[PDB]
Design a protein around this ligand. Structure first.
Ligand SMILES: *Cc1c(COP(=O)(O)O)cnc(C)c1O
Ligand SMILES: *Cc1c(COP(=O)(O)O)cnc(C)c1O
Lengths: 169, 166, 166
């Protein structure tokens, strides 16, 4: 479980260990990756989502960059098959963004490499589906879910408020 | 979402808030009348962006607010360094994306309703009991059981660890 | 001040500008009618801050501007990355301290007067001659003679270096 995009590198690193160390076939490793990983998003609006310049990846993680590029190409071939000639859909759905420098959208990488994607409240999860990852929702609605947050009743009642806990007991 | 919201609800506090995040599901669980919901709704915020937010109009025609902002600006709260909050005031009048002035009147009126309820101890605590009784949904046990069944494909209490050995 | 202003004036260019900095003394030297002065005056800028600047009202009721801003926003000038200028548009509508929209109409009208004068070559160049002839004040010789007499207490040409020896 990926609590935000901070552990997003789990997708290409699982792919790396399975394919380069464990000698598993690329396709098999990918179907294994998507089924093991799930992603939880905590933000609203797409500009808060984590991005890294590709140049930074070229230097620090050259093998993960290669894997990310391969994951993206295979993902856009699929999108191109389902929606032929839709050139702007390909740009929106791509994990790599163009601008003053090429950047890797880690959130897009999490969506593509996870079997499930959840928001943290009912309406936030609707925004996650319909706005933040609109195009991904159109392609795989079943991936997207809601898991309304919670607090532990032990710390946030039994520990901090034994008086109230007893009166209820 | 927010989780602090949930902590106050379980511990006997009433909530003054906007209709966003956890507050929405908290209202829906306990009934919105048991919560002090106020101010712009998500759609109202959008509609104010269509009109264009002019915070000056609020400062100009709300006397209690004008007095408060003038004190902050003139250095009443900072006598030795009277321009300490210049950037606060400049922001509230020209760059306030979070619509502080637009929600001030609604917030004041809402706090008065809070004041009138606290004035009656019994009806205050009755509303509290209604909040606590409807907070059960906001247990992380519920959230985790949800993740386990709908995402992880594991069942809780399928593993039963027996008493240990020393 | 500005010194680029002065460079164009000396080299045969007409000036489209606001009533601020060097433009003011340039107008006063050549007569304001020989310059394309437009838009908010210092006092008008202050008066707009008293009203509160709502850039949305300008975008909404100026069709040529709405079309231009929509193209910038929708990605007409950036087809491959249509959200490239999102922060430009967001700034012009909500955080524009420099009142770009507020001066657009006045600027357009002023550029039309520029267009009508360029359409008449002779009257264009007549106005140019009036600019060049009244630019003499903006010589750094004048500025430096001023510094020398009113600040440094030195007189220019009191030192006369004679021809050298090789
Ligand atoms: C519960 C808790 C939070 C979360 O507060 P929100 O504003 O609801 O996100 C933050 N800090 C501490 C110390 C908490 O116990
Ligand atoms: C004269 C000059 C300036 C000064 O321009 P202002 O906007 O009037 O300050 C700046 N850069 C260069 C290269 C100049 O020659």
């Amino acid at each position: 479980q990926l609590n935000d995009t901070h552990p997003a590198l789990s997708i290409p690193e699982l792919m790396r260990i399975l394919v380069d160390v464990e000698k598993v076939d690329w396709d098999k490793a990918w179907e294994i990756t998507k089924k093991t990983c799930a992603y939880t998003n905590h933000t609203v609006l797409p500009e808060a989502l984590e991005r890294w310049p590709v140049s930074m990846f070229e230097k620090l993680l050259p093998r993960h960059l290669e894997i990310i590029y391969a994951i993206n190409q295979r993902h856009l071939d699929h999108v191109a098959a389902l929606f032929p000639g839709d050139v702007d859909r390909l740009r929106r759905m791509s994990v790599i963004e163009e601008g003053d420098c090429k950047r890797i959208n880690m959130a897009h990488l999490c969506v593509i490499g996870s079997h499930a994607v959840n928001g943290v409240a009912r309406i936030h999860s609707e925004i996650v589906k319909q706005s933040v990852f609109k195009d991904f929702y159109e392609l795989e609605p079943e991936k997207f879910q809601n898991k309304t947050n919670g607090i532990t009743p032990r710390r946030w009642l039994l520990l901090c408020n034994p008086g109230l806990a007893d009166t209820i007991v | 979402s927010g989780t602090g919201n949930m902590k106050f609800m379980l511990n006997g506090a009433l909530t003054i808030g906007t209709m966003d995040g956890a507050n929405v599901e908290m209202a829906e669980e306990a009934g919105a009348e048991n919560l002090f919901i106020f101010g712009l709704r998500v759609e109202d915020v959008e509609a104010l962006d269509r009109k264009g937010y002019n915070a000056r109009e609020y400062y100009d025609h709300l006397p209690e607010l004008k007095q408060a902002v003038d004190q902050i600006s003139s250095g009443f709260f900072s006598p030795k360094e009277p321009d300490c909050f210049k950037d606060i005031v400049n922001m509230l009048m020209h760059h306030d994306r979070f619509k502080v002035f637009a929600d001030y009147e609604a917030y004041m009126q809402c706090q008065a309703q809070v004041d009138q309820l606290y004035r009656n101890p019994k009806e205050w605590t009755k509303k509290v009991i209604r909040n606590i009784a409807c907070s059960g949904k906001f247990s992380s046990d519920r959230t985790i059981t949800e993740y386990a069944r709908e995402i992880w494909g594991v069942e809780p209490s399928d593993l039963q660890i027996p008493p240990p050995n020393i």
